């Protein structure tokens with residue numbers, strides 16, 4: 251069993267061994283089960299063949315009880331999944347993307363009044379609080395100023411628990427019930443008319459969604475799925491720190507971004523999402539027997555898809571281990587060579603419905619760091635570990651000497 255070794259190698263567990271064996275897939279005993287791990291753009295296409303792979307019963311329970319909730323969309327298949335997947339997608343169109351980005355820009359500009367007056371600032375902690383406040387307000391979720399940091403911290407505890415053992419895991423195990431109870435009482439009050447809601451906002455839509463059979467969701471399940479909107483928005487803080495880390499370690503692109511328009515911002519945001527580690531792998535079950543790449547996939551066998559490795563596959567990317575935003579200058583867009591938030595199509599599979607929100611928030615945030623403030627990056631540990639899942643520059647990225655422009 252290599253579950254310990256998985257934990258020790260993190261984002262490199264699959265890549266190391268495909269490189270070693272010179273095969274795009276190998277067999278391994280993980281999580282007590284039998285696994286096929288696989289990597290590469292063609293592997294991803296097989297992984298998103300929804301007649302060969304299912305998600306029901308693929309998500310480990312420890313991950314359900316901390317990061318994501320029990321029996322949510324991640325584990326649904328078939329038309330039941332497509333039905334609920336459209337709910338999420340209705341809340342993440344370009345309209346909502348523009349709105350979340352505008353709100354973030356509004357919050358960054360106000361932050362300047364406080365940041366100028368402070369000595370240092372930890373970008374990760376600022377990001378968490380601003381995203382939580384923005385996510386709740388865009389969602390219609392009441393959020394008192396005094397609970398903002400506490401609710402954002404519970405969201406990050408959930409994110410940071412899925413890939414952990416021991417104390418780091420327990421934080422997520424205790425945050426998830428706090429958050430589900432909070433949101434569930436909102437859902438109940440919304441259904442009673444005791445809390446004002448607004449058609450088209452996330453809280454309202456989750457509270458009143460109807461399934462195929464026309465029932466509403468359990469208040470707890472509505473709470474769970476609303477939390478699967480608020481939590482990932484707060485988790486964008488990881489990407490926003492990696493964005494600033496990129497500018498610092500590759501400052502040649504700061505003037506490249508300054509004098510360029512959104513073309514350069516778009517490319518930069520993409521290379522951040524490609525180059526830096528976030529989601530290591532995805533799980534699924536072979537739902538019926540098949541053969542691919544001279545290997546037999548027996549039914550009920552668990553399979554991992556290597557997201558990190560595919561994003562650094564030299565077959566798909568030139569100098570993949572180097573950070574080069576210029577690789578996106580009017581480049582063919584495939585759906586399986588870059589999969590940091592999944593591959594395929596989001597309405598025909600499990601690909602992330604909030605990719606657009608993730609990118610526009612990143613663009614607005616990047617625009618704020620480049621055009622709106624000057625700052626120093628003082629002596630600090632900027633190391634991020636490929637063994638910590640998720641990963642983050644150790645210090646949270648400290649900024650000092652912040653000044654308006």
Ligand code: HEM
Pocket residue numbers: 323324325335338342478479482483485486487489528529532590591592593599600601602603604605607608
């Ligand atoms: C911030 C960084 C983010 C990363 C790294 C990320 C990554 C992912 C990945 C890898 C998946 C699963 C792909 C699959 O199962 O095939 C996923 C699914 C999902 N994401 Fe994200 N995502 C992010 C942001 C967001 C945001 C901002 C939202 C909402 C506003 C969101 C909502 C969801 C939902 C609801 C699912 C479940 C999709 C399904 O099972 O059909 N995510 N994400």
Ligand SMILES: CCCCCC/C=C/CCCCCCCC(=O)O
Pocket residue numbers: 308309310313317408409481482485529531532533534602
């Ligand atoms: C077989 C083990 C699989 C472990 C990972 C399963 C799924 C991971 C990605 C889910 C992303 C959901 C949206 C973003 C929210 C977040 O990152 O917390």
